[PDB]
Design a protein around this ligand. Structure first.
Ligand code: MG
Ligand code: MG
Ligand code: MG
Ligand code: MG
Ligand code: MG
Ligand code: MG
Ligand code: MG
Ligand code: MG
Ligand code: MG
Ligand code: MG
Ligand code: MG
Ligand code: MG
Ligand code: MG
Ligand code: MG
Ligand code: MG
Ligand code: MG
Ligand code: MG
Ligand code: MG
Ligand code: MG
Ligand code: MG
Ligand code: MG
Ligand code: MG
Ligand code: MG
Ligand code: MG
Ligand code: MG
Ligand code: MG
Ligand code: MG
Ligand code: MG
Ligand code: MG
Ligand code: MG
Ligand code: MG
Ligand code: MG
Ligand code: MG
Ligand code: MG
Ligand code: MG
Ligand code: MG
Ligand code: MG
Ligand code: MG
Ligand code: MG
Ligand code: MG
Ligand code: MG
Ligand code: MG
Ligand code: MG
Ligand code: MG
Ligand code: MG
Ligand code: MG
Ligand code: MG
Ligand code: MG
Ligand code: MG
Ligand code: MG
Ligand code: MG
Ligand code: MG
Ligand code: MG
Ligand code: MG
Ligand code: MG
Ligand code: MG
Ligand code: MG
Ligand code: MG
Ligand code: MG
Ligand code: MG
Ligand code: MG
Ligand code: MG
Ligand code: ZN
Lengths: 9, 155, 206, 23, 83, 60
RNA sequence: UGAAACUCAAAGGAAUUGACGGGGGCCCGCACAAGCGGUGGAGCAUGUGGUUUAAUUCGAAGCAACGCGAAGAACCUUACCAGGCCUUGACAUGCUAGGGAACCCGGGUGAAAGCCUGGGGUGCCCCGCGAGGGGAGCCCUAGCACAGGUGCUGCAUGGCCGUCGUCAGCUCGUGCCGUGAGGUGUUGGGUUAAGUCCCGCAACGAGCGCAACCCCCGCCGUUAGUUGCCAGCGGUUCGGCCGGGCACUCUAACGGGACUGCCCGCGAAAGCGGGAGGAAGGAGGGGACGACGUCUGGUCAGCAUGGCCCUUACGGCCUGGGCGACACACGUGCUACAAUGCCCACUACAAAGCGAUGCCACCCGGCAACGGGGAGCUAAUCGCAAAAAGGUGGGCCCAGUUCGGAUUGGGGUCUGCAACCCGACCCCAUGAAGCCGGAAUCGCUAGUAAUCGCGGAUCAGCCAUGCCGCGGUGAAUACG
């Protein structure tokens, strides 16, 4: 939905 | 052009012959705003056209314009979703415009290396009834003669 | 998402700058940062006095800082105590001659930044937003103004769906330049996030 | 044309100078 | 390239390690992060571990590669094609 | 990586190249006018606000 | 004639407000038509998809994402990756505690950060001849409280923006009609760029919009005359250069000026056509300005902010790498395919801006980039500066060329600590595709399109062919 840190993507 | 029909721009007559039709023809020669170069080409050919065939240059020009004005052309109309070729009479404004336009284009299709010679010879051949611009006029006049069956759709 | 700011639209016409001075490209930023750094401290403190404006003027190593306000009390203090206690701390950052003044606000309910702050504060206390708006507009018109409009935007009442609600009376012609329209914004923080209050007060045409 | 650095028009186009457009 | 009015640029802290080796009777593996260093004739014969962002890449130094830079021989991207 | 970066910008850098502009107000590293020391966004907010001396909306 | 089991939370009638129609009517917009130049093919620039990658940070997604956030990614920026480090921390306030530091220069190691370290030596007020002991800017370390996060949610938000759309609209108060949603007003005739006005009417008013007030341009005046101007006398190294002057050009503040005010005609009126005068005529040309609302449009990465998550780590410093990858596919662009062209030399005419670790005249070295000298100007003064197209003369002669300038070898210059990845520029050599572009598709109605150059922001430099501006030359066409 939107990469940024841990969430990556 | 929904509301009112546009007005026809009046052109500053040329600084030699004092003729608007000459100014209009130079504007069709002009590319990228180089009216100086444009007018220079047109006048150099007037020299050529007075040397070869010693008639008056301006006189040859106008007669060539007359021999290229088409009096009839095909347009499109509806009656359902159909697309007819309808023969229409050409307005004086449009006769002049198409005559001037086809001349430059026919001139630039010629094989002479420099621009004034192409315009000199095309204006010569046109004033005698030959040349691509005249072949283009007769071609247009033919297509309106053939589709004369659909002339009853004219407005 | 389209309308332009009503003050910056009229600057040099119906509204004048809140910082009046000249400078050159050498120290313009240094002075402008000082104005902002100074104006930061003032709005932080004099809030409880209802600060409606900060005017700045400059010559050289000196500064005006004319503070308009609804209640000069919290500014001056005891015989001019707070007015000193702040002017002390003031030039403690300016390092210049900082001559603080205090102008009274004629009608506070005719000032846009005040009307917005009274509504922003009222809704932090969990007051009926729809009502607080109509009342504020009602006060400004009772104060003689020729028109007033007030906008609160966000999670009204704490609803999950954000919303915009407003009221207006008289006339507020934002497209008109000769129309003196005071504009002011106040931001209300709540348990559930930020709301935004726009106040428009139409004083008259000049 | 304007894309050839080794001519005057090219030097004009990139706003430079050299043997092919000096001062 | 660099103006020759300036020097042929080496980070010094690497040229230091090179010269002490020549004095002491080299060799020794040389780990550097200075890709920007220019290869220099005192480096001929050694092997230098040049960092490429992820690894120190050994590079045996030969005469024909003397004028170049260190990073030229520690490629920085792995590719091996598509499809 | 924000506050540590807005602070590192004020610091004197090991080399004069590593120095970069930075909005004094919000901290943008991009679209920073030397004249105001602001960024294009804060510049617009203060101009509409009238807190920028002499500046106004241009029209021609 | 005529069931039931089973199944549903409805199936329905009329009417209302919309939206939609390959319904109708009446209008409009570069919507088509009429034109002129392009894009789609080529090479390159730049953005994107995709793949690849340790990482190729994140966002943006039909119009309205795609030279967009980026008005400047080699380091920094930088949010990603690798590795070496820091743990009240780079930063905020507050509490103690030890040292009891202030500040400025060093040393060892190390890629650096860091870790380890050594010198120059504290003002308040004081007991002061005494040893001095404390108190305190501020520092250092220890320990708390807390900081920090460009981690997530734009389906929790503010603010701001895009958009429909500069489209003519969206409404309210009272009254009237209707059981009611709601209607009327806002419909109707005429009119206009416009819910712009006129007339009519169970409507009468009013608000947000439209227009206007604001800015640039066009004519005229006034006030000003230096750094700007030179009409006329006087000198004149012949340069407005000196005397002189402000006339003019200008520059920049304030005014004048246009109102369909006048004539003719049509008309019920508002207006419409035409004409006069005038620099300008029917809103003079351009700008700023964007209704109630829509897209659960965009932005938690400019900032703010609820909530969720990370806390020797999703925080922090560093060096290096990546953001510039490349079987491919798309967008936006630059340069071209030539003779209305290309090249060389000479010679003209702008506007808006910019300029004290700035612009840099002029001189010398160098083919040159540039270097070295070296005036002037805090700049209507001095500089950027050459404007280019154009004008004159000369060369090329239809060729993949004296078209085109990609690619690549070699040699340099400049900025910068540093140009391997991955800079711009100069010089020698190289001299690719490309012969005007398939299906398809874009812009523009006049000082416009096309073409020609100029400046600025960002900025050390710069990948800018981008953006915002500026003037020079200057068209075609609109039946409908
Ligand atoms: Mg809670
Ligand atoms: Mg060539
Ligand atoms: Mg220049
Ligand atoms: Mg980090
Ligand atoms: Mg932050
Ligand atoms: Mg920088
Ligand atoms: Mg910046
Ligand atoms: Mg039955
Ligand atoms: Mg029905
Ligand atoms: Mg319909
Ligand atoms: Mg067309
Ligand atoms: Mg065409
Ligand atoms: Mg082009
Ligand atoms: Mg293609
Ligand atoms: Mg292409
Ligand atoms: Mg991406
Ligand atoms: Mg990708
Ligand atoms: Mg994405
Ligand atoms: Mg777009
Ligand atoms: Mg850039
Ligand atoms: Mg980097
Ligand atoms: Mg780094
Ligand atoms: Mg939204
Ligand atoms: Mg929003
Ligand atoms: Mg959600
Ligand atoms: Mg309009
Ligand atoms: Mg609408
Ligand atoms: Mg509608
Ligand atoms: Mg009613
Ligand atoms: Mg009733
Ligand atoms: Mg009944
Ligand atoms: Mg109703
Ligand atoms: Mg009515
Ligand atoms: Mg309506
Ligand atoms: Mg209605
Ligand atoms: Mg009706
Ligand atoms: Mg009206
Ligand atoms: Mg005068
Ligand atoms: Mg308006
Ligand atoms: Mg969404
Ligand atoms: Mg999104
Ligand atoms: Mg948040
Ligand atoms: Mg945030
Ligand atoms: Mg890099
Ligand atoms: Mg990029
Ligand atoms: Mg481009
Ligand atoms: Mg293209
Ligand atoms: Mg500059
Ligand atoms: Mg020339
Ligand atoms: Mg060839
Ligand atoms: Mg070929
Ligand atoms: Mg050639
Ligand atoms: Mg090379
Ligand atoms: Mg590089
Ligand atoms: Mg050929
Ligand atoms: Mg074409
Ligand atoms: Mg062409
Ligand atoms: Mg148009
Ligand atoms: Mg060209
Ligand atoms: Mg630069
Ligand atoms: Mg630059
Ligand atoms: Mg440019
Ligand atoms: Zn900012």
């Amino acid at each position: 939905k939107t990469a940024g840190x841990p969430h990556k993507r | 052009a929904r509301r009112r029909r546009a007005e026809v721009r009046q052109l500053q007559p040329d600084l030699v012959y004092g003729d608007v039709l000459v100014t209009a023809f130079i504007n069709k020669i002009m590319r990228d705003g180089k009216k100086n170069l444009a007018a220079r080409i047109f006048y150099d050919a007037c020299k050529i056209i007075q040397e070869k065939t010693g008639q008056e240059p301006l006189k040859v020009f106008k007669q060539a314009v007359e021999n290229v004005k088409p009096r009839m052309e095909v347009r499109s109309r509806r009656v359902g979703g159909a697309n007819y070729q309808v023969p229409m009479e050409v307005s004086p404004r449009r006769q002049q415009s198409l005559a001037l336009r086809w001349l430059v284009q026919a001139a630039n299709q010629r094989p002479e290396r420099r621009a004034a010679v192409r315009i000199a010879h095309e204006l010569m051949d046109a004033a005698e009834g030959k040349g691509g611009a005249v072949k283009k006029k007769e071609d247009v006049e033919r297509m309106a003669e053939a589709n004369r069956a659909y002339a009853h759709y004219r407005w | 998402g389209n309308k332009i700011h009503p003050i910056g639209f009229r600057l040099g016409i119906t509204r004048d700058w809140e910082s009046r001075w000249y400078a050159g490209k050498k120290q313009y930023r240094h002075l402008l940062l000082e104005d902002q750094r100074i104006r930061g401290l003032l709005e932080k403190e004099l809030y409880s006095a209802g600060l409606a404006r900060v005017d700045i003027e400059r010559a050289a190593d000196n500064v005006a800082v004319t503070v308009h306000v609804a209640k000069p009390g919290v500014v001056i203090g005891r015989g001019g105590e707070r007015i000193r206690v702040l002017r002390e701390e003031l030039a403690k950052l300016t390092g210049k001659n900082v001559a603080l003044n205090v102008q009274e606000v004629q009608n506070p309910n005719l000032s846009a930044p005040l009307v917005a702050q009274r509504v922003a504060e009222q809704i932090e206390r969990r007051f009926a937003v729809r009502r607080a708006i109509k009342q504020a507009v009602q006060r400004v018109m009772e104060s003689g103004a020729k028109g007033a409009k007030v906008i609160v935007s966000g999670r009204i009442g704490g609803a999950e769906q954000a919303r915009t609600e407003w009221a207006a009376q008289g006339r507020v012609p934002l497209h008109t330049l000769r129309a003196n329209i005071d504009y002011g914004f106040a931001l209300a923080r709540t348990t559930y996030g930020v709301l935004g209050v726009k106040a428009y007060i139409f004083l008259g045409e000049v | 044309g304007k894309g050839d650095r080794r001519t005057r028009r090219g030097k004009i186009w990139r706003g430079t100078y050299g043997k092919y457009r000096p001062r | 390239p660099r103006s020759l009015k300036k020097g042929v640029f080496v980070d010094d802290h690497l040229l230091e390690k090179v010269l002490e080796l020549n004095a002491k009777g080299e060799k020794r593996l040389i780990k550097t992060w200075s890709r920007r260093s220019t290869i220099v004739p005192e480096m001929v014969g050694h092997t230098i571990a040049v960092y490429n962002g992820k690894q120190h890449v050994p590079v045996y130094i030969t005469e024909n590669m003397v004028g170049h830079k260190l990073g030229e021989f520690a490629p920085t991207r792995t590719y091996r094609g598509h499809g | 990586a924000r506050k540590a970066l807005i602070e590192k910008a004020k610091r004197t850098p090991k080399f004069k190249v590593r120095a970069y502009t930075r909005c004094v107000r919000c901290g943008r590293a991009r679209s920073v006018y030397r004249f105001f020391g602001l960024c294009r966004i804060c510049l617009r907010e203060l101009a509409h606000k009238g807190q920028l001396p002499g500046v106004r909306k241009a029209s021609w």
